[PDB]
Amino acid sequence: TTCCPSIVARSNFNVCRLPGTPEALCATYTGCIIIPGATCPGDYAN
Secondary structure, three states: OEEOOOHHHHHHHHHHHOOOOOHHHHHHHHOOEEOOOOOOOOOOOO
16 A cells, blocks of 8 residues: 655656556655555555
C-alpha cells in the first residue's frame, strides 16, 4: 500500500507511475512511502 504526505505528493506519485516506474523509485522521488499493511498513518494521510 502507498501512503503520501500531502495531496501534491500523491498527484506527483500518480504522474511518476504513468510510464510504469516502480513504486519504490516514485516513493523516494515524491516523499510517499510503501507499507506492507493497508492502513496509512495520520502524517501520511493522502
